[PDB]
């Protein structure tokens with residue numbers, strides 16, 4: 001069982017993803033025309049891989065994929081969000097129109113740090129699209145242009161999100177019964 | 182946009198088989214811990230996301246990034262690992278999820294590589310199978326669709342990192 | 356001896372290199388002879404693989420204060436690396452450099468483009484201090500805008516190999532630095 | 542001097558280490574002499590970061606035949622690393638070793654599990670040859686099943702630091718190899 005409640009059903013998620021796709025799509029409409037390049041989705045492994053595969057199919061504009069793998073350092077990652085790069089971008093993003101695809105944004109320390117990092121590669125444009133936004137996503141030195149859902153503070157799992165590498169494969173997002181934590 | 186010459190399999194055709202072998206895979210794996218899907222970036226991310234939701238038993242994700250050496254990865258297997266597995270797979274029930282198997286040289290090497298980590302079991306599930314999965318020799322337990330010898334794109338598959346985001350698989354016009 | 360015919364002329368002898376490194380060791384040592392007390396942490400040598408491995412191993416032994424190693428591996432992106440300096444990271448630092456006194460150890464600074472990007476990358480991790488120590492500096496480093504506190508040798512614009520420096524992964528194991536005969540170029 | 546009151550005793554001095562490497566180099570050089578002729582490629586030194594970095598820089602300078610460098614970076618998975626030797630690859634070889642004459646350069650061989658795992662891994666890339674040279678060998682390496690062609694010193698089982706070898710990332714920069722005062726652990 002260990003699912004205490006269903007926060008967001010599969011139907012609700014896929015409905016808003018098609019919604020975000022249209023919005024993102026017309027904002028970057030005319031890209032493949034003016035620049036000749038596609039909208040580039042950058043995703044940090046691995047909580048947002050389910051989201052990015054669905055989102056890209058919802059975007060009515062040519063879309064490329066790019067993945068990063070990162071790892072925490074320890075006692076200061078929780079303070080500055082500086083994170084270890086295990087897998088960098090395969091391609092350069094110079095003069096590219098880049099959209100960071102996130103699963104959740106809470107502290108936003110890491111996202112803030114990633115933004116500054118990707119900025120140093122000098123892209124043509126850069127903003128963030130998150131599926132879920134927690135109450136305290138108001139701090140984080142980073143503006144989010146696209147938000148899927150504004151969710152409560154309690155820990156959620158499903159649809160890419162995990163607890164000890166579990167529950168990622170669920171089509172819905174929900175909360176765990178505290179007996180598992 | 183006038184570059185796709187042929188559509189091989191529509192989005193509906195794809196989702197059906199995935200739900201099919203997904204139920205098939207789920208029953209075969211119905212150790213005490215979850216089934217582990219391993220994918221090599223980037224071509225099979227759309228397949229592994231859809232597949233995992235189709236497999237009716239608990240399923241975990243793990244990704245590898247690899248790179249070519251050139252005159253030998255052409256010659257045979259052995260690729261450069263850019264990103265290794267996050268966790269050790271000893272005693273795990275592992276399913277290699279690939280997009281397409283052609284020469285199968287890279288697949289042959291990874292299988293031999295992943296075997297050395299002592300998994301409890303190791304099988305392969307590919308969405309597409311080209312002319313010649315006969316030439317190589319890793320037992321592919323699951324095949325979505327066996328396709329002819331022409332270059333395909335779509336549904337995660339690319340040509341110079343394009344056309345990955347398309348919901349269907351098709352053929353390119355030169 | 357090792358590579359008959361490919362080395363046109365010797366630029367820096369093994370003894371020349373070692374003497375300068377012993378000098379660099381004392382100078383750096385005096386500049387950081389304070390860290391054990393005040394900060395409590397060791398001088399951290401960050402080196403990008405792999406032209407400067409021979410240099411950093413000799414240098415670390417020539418520095419009379421406690422010294423730690425960190426290695427990075429990077430890769431070129433293409434014409435973008437040669438324009439902005441941005442490189443693909445293949446191997447990052449094992450540990451965060453927050454509040455650490457950091458000394459970048461380089462083999463050669465020419466255009467200095469990748470060094471510039473790297474230093475900006477490392478600074479964003481808020482080290483306590485950050486400086487650069489190169490073995491060789493070439494004339495085009497004048498237009499690089501990276502400040503180098505420690506320079507082993509200023510040399511001409513000719514292409515050199517030896518002491519960690521390569522051409523197609525060769526000549527790194529030479530105890531001395533020299534120039535290549537054009538028979539090797541083409 | 543460098544670490545005032547941390548080193549209990551000196552096991553191997555700098556001069557002793559350099560003297561031993563010099564013979565190792567010439568020995569390896571004699572065995573790989575007909576390389577620049579027969580195959581026409583250089584002896585390839587492969588080192589896992591980062592305990593053996595000082596050793597390979599000196600060794601490559603002590604070997605009288607052309608040698609190239611290759612570096613790997615690995616991480617521990619956990620208890621499986623300590624049982625099977627299998628490690629996470631953080632940094633792989635830059636070039637393929639197909640048809641290469643490869644010498645794995647190690648700092649210390651104790652259990653030899655990761656070394657054994659590495660050997661089998663590199664063997665699968667079809668090298669022309671593959672051997673192991675380590676600076677130090679401990680008594681428990683006899684239980685290891687990997688063959689070691691070249692050994693600098695056989696030492697006791699005591700934990701040593703210096704010359705690349707560490708304790709919590711310190712003492713790598715020592716030119717000598719010594720034993721730690723338990724007032725450090």
Ligand SMILES: Nc1nc2c(ncn2[C@@H]2CNC[C@@H]2OCP(=O)(O)O)c(=O)[nH]1
Pocket residue numbers: 047104105106107108109110111154155156157161162163
């Ligand atoms: N699966 C799951 N993970 C969560 C949740 N909230 C925080 N996290 C994670 C905590 N560390 C990273 C990640 O949040 C991203 P960040 O804004 O940088 O703090 C959650 O509800 N579900």
Ligand SMILES: Nc1nc2c(ncn2[C@@H]2CNC[C@@H]2OCP(=O)(O)O)c(=O)[nH]1
Pocket residue numbers: 281282283284285286287288311331332333334338339340
């Ligand atoms: N997008 C797309 N790529 C293809 C196709 N056939 C081969 N490929 C690729 C060529 N290099 C690797 C990959 O498959 C060969 P393998 O090593 O056996 O896995 C194809 O129909 N479409």
Ligand SMILES: Nc1nc2c(ncn2[C@@H]2CNC[C@@H]2OCP(=O)(O)O)c(=O)[nH]1
Pocket residue numbers: 463464465466467468469470513514515516520521522
């Ligand atoms: N072996 C050897 N390599 C060299 C030489 N000059 C430049 N290089 C290298 C060219 N790519 C990196 C390195 O230049 C450093 P930088 O231009 O500042 O980024 C040289 O004389 N010998």
Ligand SMILES: Nc1nc2c(ncn2[C@@H]2CNC[C@@H]2OCP(=O)(O)O)c(=O)[nH]1
Pocket residue numbers: 649650651652653654655656698699700701702706707708
């Ligand atoms: N600094 C230092 N490290 C040591 C020592 N003995 C073992 N080690 C290490 C323990 N983990 C890796 C290495 O052992 C090599 P192996 O057991 O063959 O795989 C030692 O005397 N000093």
Ligand SMILES: [Mg+2]
Pocket residue numbers: 044047048102103104
């Ligand atoms: Mg995320």
Ligand SMILES: [Mg+2]
Pocket residue numbers: 047161162163
């Ligand atoms: Mg997680």
Ligand SMILES: [Mg+2]
Pocket residue numbers: 221224225279280281
């Ligand atoms: Mg594939």
Ligand SMILES: [Mg+2]
Pocket residue numbers: 224338339340
């Ligand atoms: Mg492809």
Ligand SMILES: [Mg+2]
Pocket residue numbers: 403406407461462463
């Ligand atoms: Mg350099």
Ligand SMILES: [Mg+2]
Pocket residue numbers: 406520521522
């Ligand atoms: Mg070089």
Ligand SMILES: [Mg+2]
Pocket residue numbers: 589592593647648649
């Ligand atoms: Mg070792």
Ligand SMILES: [Mg+2]
Pocket residue numbers: 707708709710
């Ligand atoms: Mg250590």
